Design a protein around this ligand. Structure first.
Ligand SMILES: Cc1cc(NC(=O)C(=O)N2C[C@@H](C)CC[C@@H]2c2ccc3sc(C4CCN(C)CC4)nc3c2)cnc1N
Ligand SMILES: Cc1cc(NC(=O)C(=O)N2C[C@@H](C)CC[C@@H]2c2ccc3sc(C4CCN(C)CC4)nc3c2)cnc1N
Ligand SMILES: Cc1cc(NC(=O)C(=O)N2C[C@@H](C)CC[C@@H]2c2ccc3sc(C4CCN(C)CC4)nc3c2)cnc1N
Ligand SMILES: CSC[C@H]1O[C@@H](n2cnc3c(N)ncnc32)[C@H](O)[C@@H]1O
Ligand SMILES: CSC[C@H]1O[C@@H](n2cnc3c(N)ncnc32)[C@H](O)[C@@H]1O
Ligand SMILES: CSC[C@H]1O[C@@H](n2cnc3c(N)ncnc32)[C@H](O)[C@@H]1O
Lengths: 624, 299, 625, 322
């Protein structure tokens, strides 16, 4: 765990830093001016109060300021006061403390949201951010539950209403979302979510799914005291802490030592223990953990020739090739009966062979099933044909024939019993497997098999202001300022919120006997939403039937387990769309094409309308 | 055996010497083979001798009867002596004096010396007995394509390079190199056997020309091949025919006036070397990178 | 020590060869990816359909090894600029093949040769390739220092190597590069692998490559002399060269076979390693500046912007400069207050622009070193530094020092000053607006007072550096003029560049300026004689300042204050590079302009050719008052 | 790639001289192909590939009767908006003598092979509308001894100074693309205020039918223009000549200009940075015609007296759609 300690009292900065260092913390949150040291800027005489106005920067090294000290805005500063004088004064003071934290070069600075209106706070912070394009991060201290909705019901003439308030119970998030919006989604602005004694309904907690939470603040109050005197937490608090650890947020301790028998390392050690006593970090999971919410442009194996290490990661996925082998094996047993095993050889073509893991799989299946096969390995990437022919000469012999051409081109010598493909993207057909196989179909026997025989894409609406900002940052010179929103990205989604169950989008079947072949599509999907949230995009997955009951899937429900060949795809939208509980999201999708390009367009039509994204493939085309 | 056959030279008694390279695959090496049955080549099992080199072979030539001079990719000139029984092949020496691939070699009239040309732009004169370099000549400005020793003079030889220069040499002179419209690059050189006054050269454009050093004038030339001319070999015939080899994969046999007499498409890959049979003077053996060894009957 | 690689055109087993060169001590290997003699046909049957494999597999190494250890090499039979059309098209296809394969392997660099004047089609194909995938792959151009033609042995009877004087022709190889480099539109993925021969040419031929992106120096085994023991060594001139190349931190490549066969290839490498260790050890300035070599930074504006803490920290971490300031104050004290009056006349000494107060401590040490009375003021408009100042003052200085938190142009001081000490100089002297600040702070100076520094002067010199020109070119940002980066200066420790003429003074300012018609605007014209062929890319800028009489500071290379690393040089670029032939004169024009709010520079080259006027109306760069 | 609007065709047709020349060429070819005695027994299959609104069709008809020979006519067009006009004409006037074929000539599987094919696919730079590729695709259905009108064409280039037009190009910078894209693309323009710096020279030539088994429409040309004045190079003007049939030709080249013909204007290939040229120096420019499965485009560069950058590399700024 990465951790920090929150204090509103620091008598000697050196001694205090040493203490919290020995306690085991990674950093310290502290005020930079004294928290009770209110200052005047407009009116004499206290205007001319003689300095020093705070303690010197020489008291630490630049390394220490840069890595160990989170600044804190003094609590007397109220930029949204109803009083004009306090407004202007708090403006000057906020500028003062922020500019000073920047002078010290602090890695982060804390500011509180503890009411609905922080409009002028946002105005000042936005102004400041646009004064030197610095690194300095800004953490917004937002409580899960507003202090009003957390107070003890001990006021005679002001009773805490014991009724059901769905929207109201989320109000703090609203605060953030409004502030966050006024600052125009500044990447230098993040959340420091504060956690209290009473945890609210789990939808109130889920509101923060997809939000840029960098820090979770735990007070000493919420720590239950067990039989020994230890500090511990409730079972629900622990569920929460696990959720927060998946997002890898830093944890901050605030409050004084109520369990004064011990030392503050007790609180920290409870956490450390919890973090070690979770399912140990897998190989799969540690591989994907580096790609968490990392955006990448979709590969185009048809138009682009893939690099070597790309194939290398494709091959390093056993489960998938085990499935392909089993599918080939069952198809062999179905096609060639037992008595004919030696008299009937099967022509089995790997269309899109790469470096030939499918070839070795076809061979292992041939011997596992004990049948005769003649093999072709087709590949339009000559840099991989190199590897293929080296293998072939060395190992496979003349059993395999390496064919270096496009399957839409190749005039094959003899028709095929089976054709095996791998032309699927994260959205199934987004690598144009339908067109390639349609071209490669004519040289298939009138009763032959395509592995895979079917595939289907899946979509689901998602909230994630985090990923929305990541996309927003993809704006490039020399193109439309919003092109990044009109193109998909391959990404291991992590910090996001699924808003409705995935539903099938486009399906393709091979062989496609249809005399009127048209791979274009117009689909409409209605996603019921049972929460308040903000639509930022659509996650995309796929399913494919290789043969009968052997299938592959990255869809979270039907996910082929342990398979890391694909990540999910993401279709963003330019403007985020608010969705209230009970509403339905209506998305529209088109698969469009001409002789040269294939591309997708999409639009949201409910609860509100978006614009049509990537029209005429102007921002994203897939090359035929 | 490695797939790419680079050289094929007939010995006086009718034995065939072959030099092969491997230009693809994991191992890029070469090998030498001796077939006392010429029709048994290329099959390795039916051979009289064979040896594996560290590196491939670019050009190759006999040294009398027991000597084999090899220009290796290593930058080395290797001399391989033949065994007392003519069953084994042994490395007499192997010197790394060129800085880059030795691309061409030829033995002089005296048979105790040789001349080598490398991609390092240098030509070198070798005493085969002492096993040292006598002269090192940086005369060209590009990689040396071909060097052809004069048949009847020890101190004289021809060289041609990608600097578009054909140099006639004379180690006796203080400035041994002598240059002789600048057409397309020269690629192959062949002295005329009986007249040490004249020779022929092919270019990269597939044109073969005839030169008289005395008249220093291009008397004749002919567009034989559609592609680069990689080799030129005269016959031992009383009035000698001329063989021309190209990258268009054909062999062409020409008269004294450079007209096409014979032409063979049998090869499906580059044609590398070609030697006439000193036994049957009308027979001509060619080799190439399609691993074929063809015997041609010439009218 | 040295980063190194080994060049080979023969690799029988890639694994064994890599292991050998690894045990020899090399960091990487340059090798061909297809066999160098394995010419291939693409258009015409039958060899068109030659059966593969066309080269060795990628499985023979790990992705690690391909990415870090293997520099690819273009097969030498490929001639994209041949006079023969067939060879042209075939070499085009083959160059595409080998390059795309090197990219498939993910090689960190690929070698291609320039060994003739015309490589137009080579550049066309390489440019086409680069614009297919925004990849990292670097491209090293093998260019000889001396063309093989001008290096051949003079042994041709009817073609004598003329032993005449040909200034321009001796540089021809650079020309090759510069033309190729230009056709590819200054691609940052294209660099130089300069090859070095036996005979080294005139020093100007060598200097032509100053400022060029040399990544690799190629040393053949031929040029190594054999010393008394039998080891390989180089001439003294070759060694001067190697030192120059080591300062550019280029990689060194060995080519050729082992002629000193007594030893092993670690002998050449060890000669190199020895040379690198036996290099003048890094003085304090060089180690600090080495991280900032050719690193661009926007000029600080201490007037408009409040400086951060560590910025001041690096300002203070420079003893020499404050020693000089202390000595200047000390001499001025002795001059102003005579010996007998030392106890009866106290001097009002104001540090205008005090920062965190190193000048304050310097004033104190000078006061006691000289033994005179002083009352001190520390003026500062940056309150974040006023914090540090007042903490110091309360704790240490006491009421002797008065901390004044205001702009010196604003402050209505209580009593007039005997001395004013400033630090408002940039790399170009006045580029932080020291003249205007001191002009505003002047009125509260006694009618016979002193300003330390009393004078300063900027200096300019034309420089060639395609490297830094490309660095500037890459500074284009969205939402502004595409060429704004060329109309603004950058602070940078210049390193890989070529000074084309001696620095000359540009603008001078004197303080106090009694002149009733104060005008800090300037129009200067500088004529720089150039005795070499080169390409103008920008102008380096330095400064000199007189603190007091014979105590001065300078970053100017000739008069550099030694051991002082407070400033780096400034760079004024130009949009289009300008060819300059030997003997020509570069005429540049500079303006210091201003209004009520801004100050800025404009500049233009008027000879040998005209440029555009740069930063007109300060549209791309203004200095905030 | 684009279907032309109506008034575009209208200005194409409003040029008599050119269609008079086409008619005369067809007429001479008819007399050469069908001898006098066979005039009634041998009918000629004559296909207008790229017919538009059919001025070439009416020209073929007038030529057939002027020469007195039998012809069966096909009018091929991939623009259906013009096929409308064509079929209206055909029903009303031409009858079943003409067959209107609405398809790409690279696609159409014609019923019977052709005696003559007539095209109009030339731009100001000749091949810049991809007439070579279109006719190469439409060639297979030509008789093994048939004729293409035009049978040949050739592009021409000349260096020009014109700071005026250089500034006009400079002002073509658009948002959301490379700031210098305007310099890497040609423009059709009636050049007026400019300075020709050297005599035009031929750049690329194409011959139809192209029997060559190794068809390659790519080109790498190098042109050396001697300049006998001081000036500043800003671009290259481009023109074309075409042989319709033997001694009937068309040209917009200023020296050999077909008089009274205003169907084409010159093309202009600009360069990013202007280049000073002193009297006596020679301008060496390089041009490439490049292509792939989908696009065709030109690249170009000046190599003397100084080097420019290579313009429109990979067609990044200008491609011609196949
Ligand atoms: C078999 C198959 C597999 C897949 N799978 C994926 O696509 C995929 O989910 N992932 C994500 C994760 C597992 C890593 C590989 C790959 C990926 C995605 C996007 C980019 S973008 C890029 C860059 C390309 C340019 N070079 C220079 C740097 C890398 N690599 C990649 C790799 C799709 N289709 C087929 N048929
Ligand atoms: C006393 C004095 C000294 C100087 N000297 C310089 O200016 C200078 O030559 N050098 C280069 C070298 C020595 C290092 C400090 C400084 C520098 C320059 C440019 C930037 S730009 C930047 C960034 C600012 C924003 N933060 C977030 C990152 C750093 N720092 C810097 C530092 C000028 N004037 C006065 N009076
Ligand atoms: C037969 C033939 C003729 C030509 N000729 C030309 O091309 C040409 O020289 N000229 C210039 C002059 C004579 C006028 C027509 C035409 C032209 C050029 C460029 C544009 S751009 C545009 C716009 C298109 C979009 N709409 C909305 C506005 C007009 N029209 C035009 C017209 C080329 N090829 C063939 N085969
Ligand atoms: C293993 S990822 C898909 C593989 O199939 C190849 N491929 C994709 N489309 C085709 C096609 N139409 N013809 C041949 N190989 C193809 C790609 O180049 C890649 O190696
Ligand atoms: C030590 S770098 C220059 C210093 O002088 C300060 N400075 C610059 N101009 C003024 C001014 N007009 N008044 C006060 N301090 C100034 C800057 O804030 C910085 O601390
Ligand atoms: C009269 S300008 C050229 C004419 O030929 C047509 N055209 C160009 N290319 C083709 C083609 N491949 N098939 C049919 N018509 C074509 C254009 O649409 C236009 O009408």
């Amino acid at each position: 765990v990465s951790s920090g300690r929150d204090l509103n009292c620091v008598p000697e900065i050196a001694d205090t830093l040493g203490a919290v260092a020995k306690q085991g913390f990674d950093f310290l949150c502290m005020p930079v001016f004294h928290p009770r040291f209110k200052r005047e800027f407009i009116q004499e005489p206290a205007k001319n109060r003689p300095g020093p106005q705070t303690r010197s920067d020489l008291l630490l090294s630049g390394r220490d300021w840069n890595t160990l000290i989170v600044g804190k805005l003094s609590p007397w500063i109220r930029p949204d006061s109803k009083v004009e004088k306090i407004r202007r004064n708090s403006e000057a003071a906020m500028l003062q403390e922020l500019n000073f934290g920047a002078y010290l070069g602090l890695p982060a600075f804390l500011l509180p949201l503890n009411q609905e209106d922080n409009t002028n706070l946002a105005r000042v912070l936005t102004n400041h951010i646009h004064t030197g394009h610095h690194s300095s991060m800004f953490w917004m201290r937002v409580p899960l539950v507003a202090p009003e909705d957390l107070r003890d019901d001990i006021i005679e003439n002001a009773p805490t209403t014991h009724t059901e308030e769905y929207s109201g119970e989320e109000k703090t998030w609203m605060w953030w979302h409004n502030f966050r919006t006024l600052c125009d989604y500044s990447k230098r602005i993040a959340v420091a979510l504060e956690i209290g004694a009473d945890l609210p309904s789990n939808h109130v907690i889920d509101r923060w799914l997809g939000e840029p939470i960098k820090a979770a603040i735990l007070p000493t109050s919420i720590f239950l005291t067990n039989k020994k005197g230890f500090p511990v937490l409730s079972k629900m608090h622990q569920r929460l802490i696990f959720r927060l650890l998946k997002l890898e947020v830093q944890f901050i301790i605030t409050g004084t030592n109520h369990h004064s028998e011990k030392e503050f390392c007790s609180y920290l050690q409870y956490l450390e223990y919890l973090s070690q006593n979770r399912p140990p970090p897998n190989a799969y999971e540690l591989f994907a953990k580096g790609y968490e919410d990392y955006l990448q442009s979709p590969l185009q194996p048809l138009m682009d020739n893939l690099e070597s290490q790309t194939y290398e990661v494709f091959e390093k996925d056993p489960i998938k090739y085990s499935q392909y082998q089993q599918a080939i094996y069952k198809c062999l047993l179905d096609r060639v009966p037992e008595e004919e095993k030696d008299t009937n050889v099967q022509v089995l073509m790997v269309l899109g062979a790469g470096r030939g893991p499918l070839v070795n799989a076809s061979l292992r299946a041939a011997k596992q099933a004990d049948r005769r096969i003649k093999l072709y390995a087709v590949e339009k990437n000559p840099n991989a044909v190199v590897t293929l022919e080296n293998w072939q000469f060395e190992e496979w012999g003349s059993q395999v024939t390496v064919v270096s051409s496009d399957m839409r081109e190749w005039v094959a010598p003899e028709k095929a019993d089976i054709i095996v493909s791998e032309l699927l993207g994260s959205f199934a057909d987004n690598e144009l497997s339908p067109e390639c196989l349609d071209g490669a179909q004519h040289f298939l026997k009138d009763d032959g098999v395509s592995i895979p025989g079917e595939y289907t894409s899946f979509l689901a609406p998602i909230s994630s202001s985090k990923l929305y900002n990541e996309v927003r940052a993809c704006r490039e010179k020399d193109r439309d300022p919003e092109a990044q929103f009109e193109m998909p990205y391959v990404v291991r989604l992590h910090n996001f919120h699924q808003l409705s169950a995935p539903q099938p989008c486009f399906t393709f079947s091979h062989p496609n006997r249809d005399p009127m072949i048209d791979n274009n599509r117009y689909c409409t999907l209605e996603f019921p939403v049972e929460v308040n949230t903000v639509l930022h995009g659509f996650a995309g997955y796929f399913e494919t039937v290789l043969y009968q009951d052997i299938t592959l899937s990255i869809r979270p429900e039907t996910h082929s387990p342990g398979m890391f060949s694909w990540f999910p795809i993401l279709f963003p939208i330019k403007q985020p769309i608010t969705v209230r509980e009970g509403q339905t999201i209506c998305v529209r999708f088109w698969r469009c094409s001409n002789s040269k390009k294939v591309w997708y367009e999409w639009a949201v039509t409910a609860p509100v309308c978006s614009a049509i994204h990537n029209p005429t493939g102007r921002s994203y085309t897939i090359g035929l | 055996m490695e797939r790419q056959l680079e050289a094929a030279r007939y010995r006086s008694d009718g034995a065939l010497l072959l030099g092969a390279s491997s230009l693809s695959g994991r191992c890029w090496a070469g090998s030498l083979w001796l077939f006392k049955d010429p029709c048994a080549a290329p099959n390795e099992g039916f051979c009289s001798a064979g040896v594996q080199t560290e590196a491939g072979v670019a050009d190759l030539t006999w040294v009398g009867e027991r000597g084999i001079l090899v220009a290796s990719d290593s930058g080395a000139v290797e001399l391989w002596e033949l065994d007392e029984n003519e069953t084994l092949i042994v490395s007499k020496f192997c010197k790394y004096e060129h800085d880059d691939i030795v691309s061409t070699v030829s033995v002089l009239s005296s048979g105790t010396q040789a001349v080598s040309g490398s991609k390092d732009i240098c030509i070198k004169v070798w005493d085969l007995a002492q096993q040292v370099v006598l002269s090192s000549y940086r005369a060209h400005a590009a990689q040396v394509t071909c060097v052809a020793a004069s048949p009847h003079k020890d101190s004289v030889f021809l060289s041609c390079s990608e600097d578009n220069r054909i140099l006639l040499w004379d180690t006796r002179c203080p400035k041994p190199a002598s240059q002789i419209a600048p057409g397309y690059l020269p690629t192959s050189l062949a002295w005329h056997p009986q007249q040490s006054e004249v020779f022929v050269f092919g270019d990269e454009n597939g044109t073969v020309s005839l030169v008289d050093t005395k008249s220093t004038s291009c008397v004749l030339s002919s567009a034989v091949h559609s592609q680069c001319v990689t080799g030129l070999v005269f016959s031992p015939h009383s009035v000698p025919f001329l063989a021309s080899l190209s990258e268009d994969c054909s062999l062409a046999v020409l008269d004294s006036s450079l007209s096409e007499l014979f032409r063979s498409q049998a090869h499906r890959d580059f044609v590398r070397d070609a030697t006439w049979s000193p036994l049957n003077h009308s027979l001509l053996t060619t080799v190439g990178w399609d691993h074929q060894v063809v015997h041609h009957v010439v009218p």
